[PDB]
Amino acid sequence: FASLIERQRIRLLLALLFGACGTLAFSPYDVWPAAIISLMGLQALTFNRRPLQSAAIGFCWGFGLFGSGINWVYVSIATFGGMPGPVNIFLVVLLAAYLSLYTGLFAGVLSRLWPKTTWLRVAIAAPALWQVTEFLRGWVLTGFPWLQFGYSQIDGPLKGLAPIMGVEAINFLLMMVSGLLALALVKRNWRPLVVAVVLFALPFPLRYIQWFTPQPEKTIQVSMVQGDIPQSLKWDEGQLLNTLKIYYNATAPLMGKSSLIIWPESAITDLEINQQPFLKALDGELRDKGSSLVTGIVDARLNKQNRYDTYNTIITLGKGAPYSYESADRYNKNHLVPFGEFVPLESILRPLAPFFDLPMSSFSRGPYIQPPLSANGIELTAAISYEIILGEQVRDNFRPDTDYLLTISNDAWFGKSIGPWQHFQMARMRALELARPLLRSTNNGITAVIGPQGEIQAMIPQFTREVLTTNVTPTTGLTPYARTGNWPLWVLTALFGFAAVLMSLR
């Protein structure tokens, strides 16, 4: 049994098993210790492997993590994309394989510069190189920072580290802690595990410090509405009036009683200019009662060059924010979803390979930093769906005078899969590091109110048409992550990178 692990093909098979165990740590399978096992399974099979041989181990580990965690993408591709089954499976495998290069790149470089299995490789070299490769996965071709082992600790021992340096600190720390556990197992030494136990127990008290301050006499009654609208590519024509009637009939009783009313992404499945009387009259009704509505709409502004820019807008109506087509209380989606809203790199792919379905018209991008939306005297930092998994853009748009965090989204393409849950967990992450309540409204998704510590305050069942009426108290105060950002971690990464690379160049 000891003579079988040294085989290369045995290492690859175990990489799939240990890689797949990582997906059992996210929201649908709330098992946080399944991330340490996956990480310690990564930097324990790569031990005593020459370069270009441990990269295959890392690639297979990544293929087992992104091939079993990111597989809900098949639901959206098969159901809506007009492509045959073999092509649909091919794209999911290709996406898993592509995301596995960064894991493969991490292993091929870790075992090249640091071949010997020592504490320098696992405690120092691995977390610094892991953070760099994770950044590259989240930066190349607009990135895809999905399935990061820092969101699994939203309710865990390491949740206190999120307000200090962000989610990436948990990813950095878990790789360091998991590596020492792997070093202890392989080398049969109690020192690596003793250090790992102490290192893992240090951030536990950090979850009992409240950087925020709840404000009792400023609370409102949010009334986020879950449409349960069936999905379509063209959004249909007759169904345009039905969805407007569904939201309006489910909102009119909520007016007056509720201060803020929130609708999901693309709640109005039409261009903003096309429905002016509906919005102007609705704003008048809300203003006369004392409620403000925040809804996601698609607007095609006319640029100074006489070319339309189809933004993904979040308009605000009602009391405290009168609606006007020239108003500044709008949010335009900056980071578009690859292959869903825009082609990451066209003119080399669209004419070359028209067999794969691509969107004929692509959305435009808004400013990177935008002021918080004003709604009935409340400042909200919007983040449309995919933008909530980006911990940097949300922090940059965040301001001290921000009351709530908005996560207008529509994860109805993926059906009953685990994608909506994993997205919900990442959205839940951007409420503990910023210490602001998060108001997430979705269509056929997890419509919930997240507290200032990544805690689910109120929630409604998925795939049903319901309104989530609850009281939310705004919080004040700045976390160390909000005040500084992600640069304190990159200083630590640079210092560890400088220290580790110098040791590899004796």
Author numbering: 3 to 508
Which sentences from the paper describe this structure?
Lnt is a 57-kDa protein that is present in diderm bacteria. It converts a diacylated BLP (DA-BLP) to a triacylated BLP (TA-BLP) using glycerophospholipids (GPLs) as acyl donors. The reaction is proposed to proceed by a ping-pong mechanism at catalytic triad residues Glu267, Lys335, and Cys387 (Escherichia coli numbering).
The M2 state has the second substrate, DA-BLP, in the binding pocket next to the thioacylated cysteine of Lnt ready for step 2. Note that the P2A and P2B structural representatives are remarkably similar. The main difference is at the end of arm 7, where the loop (residues 234 to 236) changes orientation in response to the disparate sequence and position in the binding pocket of the peptide parts of the products. The three hydrocarbon chains in the two structures superpose essentially over their full length. The TITC alkyl chain aligns perfectly with the amide-linked acyl chain, while the sn-1 and sn-2 chains of the diacylglyceryl in both Pam3CSK4 and FP3 align with MO2 and MO1, respectively.
